[PDB]
Amino acid sequence: GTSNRDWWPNQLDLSILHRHSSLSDPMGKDFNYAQAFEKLDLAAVKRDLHALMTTSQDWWPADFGHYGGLFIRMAWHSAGTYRTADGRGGAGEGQQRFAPLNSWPDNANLDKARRLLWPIKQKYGRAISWADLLILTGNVALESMGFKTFGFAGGRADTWEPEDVYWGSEKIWLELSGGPNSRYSGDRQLENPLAAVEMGLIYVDPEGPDGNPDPVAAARDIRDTFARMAMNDEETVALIAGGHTFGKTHGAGPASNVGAEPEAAGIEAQGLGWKSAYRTGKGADAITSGLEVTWTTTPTQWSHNFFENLFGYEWELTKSPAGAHQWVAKGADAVIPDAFDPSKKHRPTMLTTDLSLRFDPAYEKISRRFHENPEQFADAFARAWFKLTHRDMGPRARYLGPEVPAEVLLWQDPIPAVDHPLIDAADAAELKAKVLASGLTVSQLVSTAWAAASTFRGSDKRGGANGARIRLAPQKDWEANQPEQLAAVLETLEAIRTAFNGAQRGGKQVSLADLIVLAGCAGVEQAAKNAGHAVTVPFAPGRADASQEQTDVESMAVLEPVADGFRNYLKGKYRVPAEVLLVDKAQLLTLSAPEMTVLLGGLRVLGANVGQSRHGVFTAREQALTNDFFVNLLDMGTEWKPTAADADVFEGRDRATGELKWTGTRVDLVFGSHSQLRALAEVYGSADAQEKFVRDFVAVWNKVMNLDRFDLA
Amino acid sequence: GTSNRDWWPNQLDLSILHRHSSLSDPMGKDFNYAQAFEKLDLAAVKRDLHALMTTSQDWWPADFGHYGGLFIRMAWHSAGTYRTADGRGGAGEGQQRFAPLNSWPDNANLDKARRLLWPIKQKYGRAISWADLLILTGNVALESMGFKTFGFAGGRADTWEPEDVYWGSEKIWLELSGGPNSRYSGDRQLENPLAAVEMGLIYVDPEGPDGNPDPVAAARDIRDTFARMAMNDEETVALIAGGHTFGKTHGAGPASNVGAEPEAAGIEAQGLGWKSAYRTGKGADAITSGLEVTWTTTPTQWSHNFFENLFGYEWELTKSPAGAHQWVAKGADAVIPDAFDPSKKHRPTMLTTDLSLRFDPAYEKISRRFHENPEQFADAFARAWFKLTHRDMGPRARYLGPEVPAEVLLWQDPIPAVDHPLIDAADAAELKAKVLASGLTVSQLVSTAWAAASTFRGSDKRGGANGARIRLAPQKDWEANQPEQLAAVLETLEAIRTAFNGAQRGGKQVSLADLIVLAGCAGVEQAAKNAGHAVTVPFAPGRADASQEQTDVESMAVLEPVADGFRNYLKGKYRVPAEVLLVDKAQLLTLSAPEMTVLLGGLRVLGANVGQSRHGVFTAREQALTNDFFVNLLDMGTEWKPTAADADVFEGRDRATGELKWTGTRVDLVFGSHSQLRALAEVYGSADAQEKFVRDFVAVWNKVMNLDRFDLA
Ligand code: HEM
Ligand code: HEM
């Protein structure tokens, strides 16, 4: 059946905004996963998981009699899709169970792992999500094998359909670089937002870059991908060597024996894939990656053998039974156990990417320090496994259960506890009046609160106005934030704050984080008053101010908006059309198409554009909260044409006189072109819609102001 | 960006079920269009429309100073996409304004018509839907030009995204038949459910079949397509000649002058398309279809000149200025007015398809009767225009406003008024107990109520249990309905009915339509009781019983289920996989994926399968309402393989012993295969899910029982 995507493959796609509807979710509208989890008997679940480790099923027998390696890999792949550029991927939504991730080549036979966990999932039902269960199982595998974890938080709610993530443009699994849809250009520069070297891989190619078995060049890829997953050199080394202390790879025969991945398999496969024609197709005969490497002399127990082997032998290039490049220890005895036959032993083996930990000079220093000080290695690995598996969970307030680590970690973007009375409704009214008496304008107030709140992204639940990080490096210097204007607003709000707090007794005080947001609310109220209308903008106090030392400047850099169509901002010239980037921003803000539409139209007329641009400011009463944007956008009296100077700017002229009435960007005019967006704009541009527009604007403004408010969830 | 559809293009698509979410709808959750419409000043709207017909805009000047022909075409196209096979298309959702219909070649320049209506749309806002306004404008156009319409109903609520309709498989607009995706096979057999001869056409090619200008062969296509749009020969002739009493076609120059359709046009086009490089590109120079025909001497006034010309001249094959085949009156005077130059006149002209009305022998007899009796022609046209424009509106209960026709028409599947008090809650309890005491089984009761209610389709709002048409021809003899079993059930319910009604005082009585539904309710309660669970199934009385004489048997044929995966039923062998057909049926029933899932799993274990088939009956307590279907489908101890006899039937065997446990179809096992459906099944198959399964089942059962209950809206 031919579809709209076939006819118009470059038309803007809005379905990414209308994912995660109550239509596809089986749980009732009222279901609250945190509440269900909080009642789970987590200790019972962990007992069941421990039992499972050595309960081998014949349809996928356990290596060494212990599923722990398989499960650590499962948990590591669940978390390992995470990209810092957009916060997408990661373990927090359980997306490993859906397309495409359930069928990525690097996820081969993790279908079997997941199926092993169905009886437990079934037994505890809604009180433990698959998303949580996958991480918990990895933890229990570690514990079962003698490694003490740093802790565990529940609270990842399950999702019910695939997310729309850009995973690259290649049309071939595992395609090497430089093809027609290459994710690399220049001197091996990976395109943002990607964090893997090939389509369908988690990070890097275990044989080496584009298959070339060079550990030194492989290190470069490892460093770059892992940095794009928020991991530094120490964390990277700890995770790779820690992981590879356990289990084995699977490459017992040629890859051509492996059949269809799960999404391609027959209905009778019942959701599994990669069925293999090689010998028994499983166990001793398994084929997953094609590599045949067992790293340590005790693959089912924590040890210090990984670095003992890495440094204690010289390594020779060889091939697995499937023809894959890997490494064998020169002159070594057969000291590695076989996974199934007690009478067979094997020489130590390594991947190319394992040898990178020794042959890259900066990794070599860390690895040697871990070899000499295994307690340092064990602590680094524990910490990095916690980070790996919680990096997309958001503020600590979302962390559930009895194993949450008390230690506050910098990567959590921590927010201090509030320890004083909060402002009440009378105080909020007093502060809004002081703010409006100061001389700050509607445009300034709205722009500043928007700058502060709109850093939030739902993908990894980072950002937002909590913390008052807008006052700190690097937010305060971001171009989109208008650093000089912002400094002036903040100075005035800081003096309001200081004066209010100085007059209180008790310990009541207002945070600057709250005051920024409240001031934005005063600006939206005043804008409604400018339009002749009473309005009340909801405000919830309780944000705190984080310090500079609680704000990792390098980590915060991925939150910088380089495109923000809500402020008609584009930092540079991109390949992707600006309206595409607006929908991507809308998705990160968790907005539906209607919310995106009302929000942008209001921001326009309130003066939120960067640089005071008149692009899309379709009103003759700027700083008044009206539906002017939509009424004027849809007026057929105006004709639109791209300028000579710039094809991404448009001039709107009176159709009869030729006179210039407005200018706009693609972000502006898409509302008058896209057939679904223009249907939305029509509702808000109708003569019966001024009250609707204000009500809907205030609701979405409030939504944005509270996106990070998990302390009120 | 590569998507799941690219990787796995034949995987089943569930997004058709989660269209029309509250996420994409800008109106609040509580908005009720009927309430808004009921207070519209419809007369004021029609006054503004009447004024509009002769107020020309320079950006698309009005032919002859009158937009009436443009707007009649607009409304005929709005309604003209309707197919009886599935009820899809039609005017009732305003889908002309979205992709793909907004960009079909046959809809060329209707973008301009719709734009001309924005000021009115804007003025009246949410109180008149685009869907209604498109039809109302066609009516007003007819009225303004001297034609008395049969009436008008409002109540088509607007939609906010495109429907997922199968419009054919061709990858080229207007592709002639016999291509690699040909919609024709055999001796010019058009594939179901399609109702047009080419991709992007409303019905037929105005030049003739695949462009061969033969009126006799074009008649064949006309008859077949119009029959697939529920029109008979008399209605077809009336419509075509009626329409072509007005306006003109547009073909002033070559087609290559016409640019991109709206979905492909530049953002600056602001939702318009087909911009033409030919002279002024509009008005006297317009190009729409490429044909250049004006049918009558008064294109802005109702007349009987179309048949006068048709029969009063002989016709010669000629070419338009764009090279299209059309017909000109041999030896005629220049009596047809020009659309813009008062000093020019033209000879009469016709399309090939217009001459079909004279050269097809059956059309000729009708056309001649209409020529001799133009009052007959006007009445037939008025009735057929009403049918055309209301065919997908559903039961007369949905019809709103002051111009609804009082005459009840057979094609409306009419339901007699109820004229007696209804049963109350205590009566319903008494009846459920009588039904259960009769000996009728859970399987009988659930199967019969399902058979009666599940003919409903949301596409045109036909079908459902109201009417008790299950007792009548042709429903009572449909294979899916198990005619002999059904007759026995109905006899027993009819005796219960007679005994209850005989005992009442006052005029209280219960309809057989209500009793069939109530009995099904008693069967679901009893099945819950059989499982250890007391539940009350909601029931709403007020259905009435329609007669055989109020039931058009031929029209009812398109509602026969030839595939019903809810009953594990396939009447024959189809190209489309059965699971595809289940999701198509779920969409017709207005079901979400969770609803489809729960409902199927419960039906299985209640014994609703046709023929008492064991396929999918994964329980040892049939006729008890339990979640056994899901628990047993998801049990990894059972291995599934296609049978030798039939690849579409599967055996489930114990994995260890080989013992045969179950058999299933693709419809059953897709719940264990598809990654999204299996996630749903897992929720219902969990150990905490018994109460949820029962509650969700009862709610979806009740929803199906009430699909046609617009009397309670
Ligand atoms: C440069 C990074 C990495 C590369 C290229 C990589 C590569 C792979 C490959 C190819 C396999 C074999 C799959 C198979 O055939 O069954 C595997 C196994 C595994 N990896 Fe990694 N890996 C990396 C990092 C990680 C990390 C960070 C962890 C966890 C902290 C991890 C834990 C595991 C474990 C436990 C196994 C063994 C699976 C089993 O016993 O079934 N690896 N690795
Ligand atoms: C076999 C069926 C039909 C065919 C092949 C057909 C074909 C066409 C074509 C090719 C045009 C010219 C489009 C343009 O170039 O602007 C047109 C115009 C029009 N048709 Fe039809 N038509 C059919 C049926 C109908 C019916 C059922 C109605 C309404 C009852 C309708 C009403 C009109 C009107 C009013 C116009 C004039 C548009 C104007 O003045 O701008 N036609 N038709």
Ligand SMILES: [Cl-]
């Ligand atoms: Cl994601």
Ligand SMILES: [Cl-]
């Ligand atoms: Cl439709």
Ligand code: NA
């Ligand atoms: Na994420």
Ligand code: NA
């Ligand atoms: Na329809």
